[PDB]
Design a binder for this molecule. Structure first.
Ligand SMILES: C#Cc1c(F)ccc2cc(O)cc(-c3ncc4c(N5C[C@H]6CC[C@@H](C5)N6)nc(OC[C@@]56CCCN5C[C@H](F)C6)nc4c3F)c12
Ligand SMILES: Nc1nc2c(ncn2[C@@H]2O[C@H](COP(=O)(O)OP(=O)(O)O)[C@@H](O)[C@H]2O)c(=O)[nH]1
Ligand SMILES: [Mg+2]
Length: 169
């Protein structure tokens, strides 16, 4: 079986944990403990290959130690998550991408930009704004709802496929 280390990053409250649990357990958990950082495993067949996804759902205090740097460096691909009704969480994406680039020592790291909470009508981040950011980064952009499950599988599997591409270069 091939193992993939995925890391889900982004501001508090954007739905990182909801997305992760939807993928793992196939249901929407509304108010999952905002402080728990943990990793979750799922076995799935993707494009004919049996794969073990090890998903780190990030949380907790903002700190920049060598210990945390090495922890994050073990990730092979990153989901950058913002909420489409929270402009600050979108503006924070630059920060998260630069910290990834810093610890991986590379500008070519598999990443996918996710705009979550698409089920809401109160949108503040334009789809064109978000797409344009992803195009300048050269990475895929997918809008999701952990509540309705729209796009969840697609976001995670697109990241797996990006990692496969990057290993085949
Ligand atoms: C992630 C990651 C992260 C990566 F992807 C990659 C490498 C990393 C290497 C690190 O050593 C460490 C990280 C790492 N761990 C936690 C962070 C964190 N906490 C506060 C809340 C919001 C999420 C959760 C975790 N709880 N928060 C903010 O950024 C916050 C903001 C708001 C106040 C000040 N800053 C700077 C920007 F303005 C945004 N960054 C964080 C960070 F970089 C890394
Ligand atoms: N309407 C809606 N609410 C969501 C969605 N994803 C998460 N939530 C809610 O957003 C809040 C924060 O989500 P959580 O998964 O804890 O975010 P995290 O801090 O990034 O782990 C919770 O009340 C969730 O139930 C979504 O796709 N749609
Ligand atoms: Mg969480």
């Amino acid at each position: 079986m091939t193992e993939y280390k995925l890391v889900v990053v982004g501001a508090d409250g954007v739905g990182k944990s909801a997305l992760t649990i939807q993928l793992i357990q196939n249901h929407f958990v509304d108010e999952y403990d905002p402080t728990i950082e943990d990793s979750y495993r799922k076995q799935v067949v993707i494009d004919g290959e049996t794969s073990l996804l090890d998903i780190l759902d990030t949380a907790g205090q903002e700190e920049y130690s060598a210990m945390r740097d090495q922890y994050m460096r073990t990730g092979e691909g990153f989901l950058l998550v913002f909420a489409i009704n929270n402009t600050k969480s979108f503006e924070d994406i630059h920060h998260y991408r630069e910290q990834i680039k810093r610890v991986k020592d590379s500008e070519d790291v598999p990443m996918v930009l996710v705009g979550n909470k698409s089920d809401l009508p109160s949108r503040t981040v334009d789809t064109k704004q978000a797409q344009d950011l992803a195009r300048s980064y050269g990475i895929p952009f997918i809008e999701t709802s952990a509540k309705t499950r729209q796009g969840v599988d697609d976001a995670f599997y697109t990241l797996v496929r990006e990692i496969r591409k990057h290993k085949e270069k």
